[PDB]
């Protein structure tokens, strides 16, 4: 019972956009 | 090198001989480039006299090096 890992694409991209400052 | 018996001798002594010889050429090269720089330094104060400085040098050991 781990529910190990899974991620997104667009989400990560715009989150890095907010991280671009 | 005529006295060192280059093609006679084993590969190891040959290698040491050749290493020192390339050091000779290497020291020739860089130290001569230092003299080139210094000559251009004088030339910039000597340019008022002439510009016949061909700067073509074929140092005799060239084909010996090759």
């Amino acid at each position: 019972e781990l529910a190990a890992e899974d991620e997104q694409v667009f989400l990560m991209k715009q989150q890095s956009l907010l991280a671009k400052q | 090198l005529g006295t060192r018996k280059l093609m006679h001798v084993a590969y190891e002594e040959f290698e040491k001989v050749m290493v020192a010889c390339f050091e000779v050429f290497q020291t020739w090269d860089d130290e001569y480039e230092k003299l080139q720089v210094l000559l251009r330094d004088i030339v910039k104060r000597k340019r008022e006299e002439n510009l016949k400085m061909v700067w073509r040098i074929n140092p005799a050991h060239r084909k010996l090096q090759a």
Partner: protein
């Protein structure tokens, strides 16, 4: 060349000929039609009107976007689109005709050249990344297993975007990038093939009617593919196997109860 032909026809009488006087006119107007100094001037013009700043756009390596479409998505983009063609333009004018080409533009082109291959590799990596994301999200099961590698790719993508213009550390990132997306792509392709073999067995579980040997054979083949999945470990492989097994149980029990009634 045609004028040379006519120059050979009479020498000098073809000029003030019965119709050569009109040939001369056709040629003169056609010379004025065939002019390239206008184009050379417009080239040097446009390049010196707005490509004055387009030249050294190497710093902001990564740039996020906006794409007004359904959902209004945003992509990633490096800043080298027309500049590369401008480099080719300058080389063509120089070797071709040779003008008193603006030296400032030539040296700015030189600076674009010395950083251009890096950008090519980056742009292709981005494009392959986008193509793979298209293939991945067009599927849904695959995401469970690809999750780790997809996060890996985005980890380096984040580390690549975060920095802009790393004059010292550039080449290793480029090479790291190329191999990550290269692997990633091979993994998606590999997995796709694997999955379709799986599904031909799965969808064929209602075909070989009531033969335990054949059933066994099918299952063995499927898990051979599963060890293939295990080696180059995907992300959450047993979870996806749980899913499989549940539907396999249903196809099994269904074929069973059908044969049960018939028997």
């Amino acid at each position: 060349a045609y004028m040379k032909r006519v120059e050979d026809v009479l020498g000098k009488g073809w000029e003030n000929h019965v119709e050569g006087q009109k040939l001369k006119q056709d040629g003169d107007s056609f010379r004025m039609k065939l002019n390239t100094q206008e184009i050379f001037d417009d080239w040097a013009r446009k390049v010196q009107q707005r490509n004055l700043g387009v030249s050294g756009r190497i710093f902001t390596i990564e740039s996020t976007r906006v794409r007004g479409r359904t959902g209004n998505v945003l992509k990633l983009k490096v800043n080298f689109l027309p500049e590369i063609i401008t480099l080719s333009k300058e080389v063509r004018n120089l070797k071709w005709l040779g003008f008193r080409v603006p030296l400032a533009i030539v040296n700015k082109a030189h600076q674009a050249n010395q950083l251009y291959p890096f950008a090519i590799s980056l742009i292709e990596s981005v494009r392959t990344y986008e193509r793979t994301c298209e293939k991945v999200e067009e599927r849904n099961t695959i995401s469970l297993l690809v999750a780790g590698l997809k996060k890996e790719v985005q980890a380096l993508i984040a580390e690549g975007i975060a920095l802009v213009w790393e004059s010292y550390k550039l080449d290793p990132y480029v090479q790291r990038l190329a191999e990550t997306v290269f692997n990633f792509q091979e993994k998606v392709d590999d997995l796709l093939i694997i999955e379709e073999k799986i599904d031909l067995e799965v969808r064929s579980l209602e075909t070989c009617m009531y033969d335990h040997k054949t059933f066994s054979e099918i299952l063995n083949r499927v898990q051979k593919a599963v060890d293939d999945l295990n080696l180059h470990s995907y992300s959450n492989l047993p979870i996806w196997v749980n899913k499989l097994d549940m539907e396999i149980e249903r196809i099994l029990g269904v074929r069973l109860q059908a044969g049960l009634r018939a028997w």
